[PDB]
Amino acid sequence: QELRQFIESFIQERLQGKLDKLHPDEDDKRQTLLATHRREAWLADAARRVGQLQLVTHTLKPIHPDARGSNLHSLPQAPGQPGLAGSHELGDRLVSDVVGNAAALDVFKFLSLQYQGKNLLNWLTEDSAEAVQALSDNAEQAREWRQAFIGITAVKGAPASHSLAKQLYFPLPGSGYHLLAPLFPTSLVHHVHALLREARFGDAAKAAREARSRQESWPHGFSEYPNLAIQKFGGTKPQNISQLNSERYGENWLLPSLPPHWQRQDQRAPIRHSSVFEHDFGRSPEVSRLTRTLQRLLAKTRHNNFTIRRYRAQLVGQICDEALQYAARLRELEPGWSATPGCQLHDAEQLWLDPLRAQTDETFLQRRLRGDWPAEVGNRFANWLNRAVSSDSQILGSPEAAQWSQELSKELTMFKEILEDERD
């Protein structure tokens, strides 16, 4: 019988909280009516409004706010295939959204306090031993309250869709089709959002950043998520959509799924003495991470040397392809290639990573770089690659520098065959 002051305190807080709009000329029955209706019959008013709401983990409103159809509460079975992430992974971590008209949402607060303080969150409808000494009512009123608070988890709708929903077609193996109607994963989005905001700012994530600024970092973790995007649902009033939506403040965050280069910048391979003859290497701004990994990647011992050697080989293999794509899109993108500054010296890069014949094509212009042996460029690229991979008596006197040279030799061995099938 100790659960009779909580609902009375909530009703009294709601009644005393309806005083910020004070009117002494239009309150002849407004103040008395608000005090009298919110005294004893407020439970009947909540029971009348409980029918609109529904407990839902897959909402249809995010796709469009005008669309009225059918929302589903279900946890799907786990797929057999490996390597798939979905909303089936949520177990105890799942939360439930509430859908319905906005005016009923405050009534859900009266349905949402049963999991706080007391343990009768599943004791509002059934198991009425906590619903009689704390309900303080008759038997018919208790039956009506148990029928009203149990309707949150009901089906509550006939199976329907809308013309503003998606409904795509999917092909069967050698047969007709299936109609798929995708819904919005509210609970999965809420779980990913709770996992993301804590990594962005919180207790340990900010304390490890303070330890980073204090330059005394211990073994611990903090993450960093670059170039997210923001998508907004609703507008100035985000409670129309879903209860969960309001918590995120009518919003949700999206992860970058972009291609390798989405911000093209013109390539400066013009007639420059410092940008033509010195541009035989290709120092781009996307090789800083690979250069920093190759710099601090040549110190590991033989207790874990296999993964470090494979990582160095993978970094070199990626660094070759970046230079190949930069030569294919930088000189090949711009439709002009004039005479280089100092053509007696700026002609190796202007011959290898240079375009075809143009309006200034002389007699010995289309018969020089296509007829000559295009195999010095591989050794020239190896001479640039030898500076990046540092060698000395510490590596050359040991047996790891020989394999570190043989890996670069096996990489640059295809540099004359894949980089020499254009002219010859």
């Binding site: 295939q81 390597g83 299936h178 949700n252 291609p259 294919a328």
Partner: protein, 305 residues
Amino acid sequence: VTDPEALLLLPRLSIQNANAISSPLTWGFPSPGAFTGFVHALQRRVGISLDIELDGVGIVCHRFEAQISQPAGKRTKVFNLTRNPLNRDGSTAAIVEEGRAHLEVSLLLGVHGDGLDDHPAQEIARQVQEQAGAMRLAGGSILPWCNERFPAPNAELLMLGGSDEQRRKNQRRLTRRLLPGFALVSREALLQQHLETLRTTLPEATTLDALLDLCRINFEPWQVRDKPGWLVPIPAGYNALSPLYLPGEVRNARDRETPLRFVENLFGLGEWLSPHRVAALSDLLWYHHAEPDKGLYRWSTPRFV
């Protein structure tokens, strides 16, 4: 799901105002389900009358720009919207948000039909390319040819005819005109083995895509963990959460002659590769498979590595 008899190029498709969001969790490139649905629509509208079958698609992204903005030097991005017409009463309408992008891609298709034997190859390539320039791919229209340049006419490479050296030289020929951009493949096994490596804490797979699309730094007791490439979280099909219904049961259906099902997305891992570093060009092709007894409707790229 056989090895295709021929490959069909679509050389430089410029698409304006495609769909950028593509998933309830990502926002980059559009989903590959759009590309497989596009090639199935192209099959329905051409290949029934030309007696061929098209099943595979290879997505090489030459370039990509998005209609995004950067507010106040914050570390987020927003979407540039469009202005809708007014309401019936004539005040304004509520805003729904969608992202648009301008991309330029290339698509290589696989042909298995018997129509190759009786007709010339360039006629089939020309008719497919002519019919493809009149519909859209990702919600955005396909832009046609511009003046003052030489356009690219598509060719039909034959894969199941010839010697192996001539095969390898033709596959080295067709990779010359598709190197500027990169290709997109799927990585289910790599995500599975990376889940099984760090499985000593929590076996939830969704905490693995959210452990490869970040910059993790556990410093010294200043180093950056070696990324093995360009790992991106992608949508990887659908998964049902409702029983299959009857063609008249659900109201407001798109078609009243096809059963309907409610559905959630599935999230997997993918990678962007240079086109040189693959063995053959038919390893790239995307296919889709369904198990209607379960609710598994999934597109992926098989026979890769």
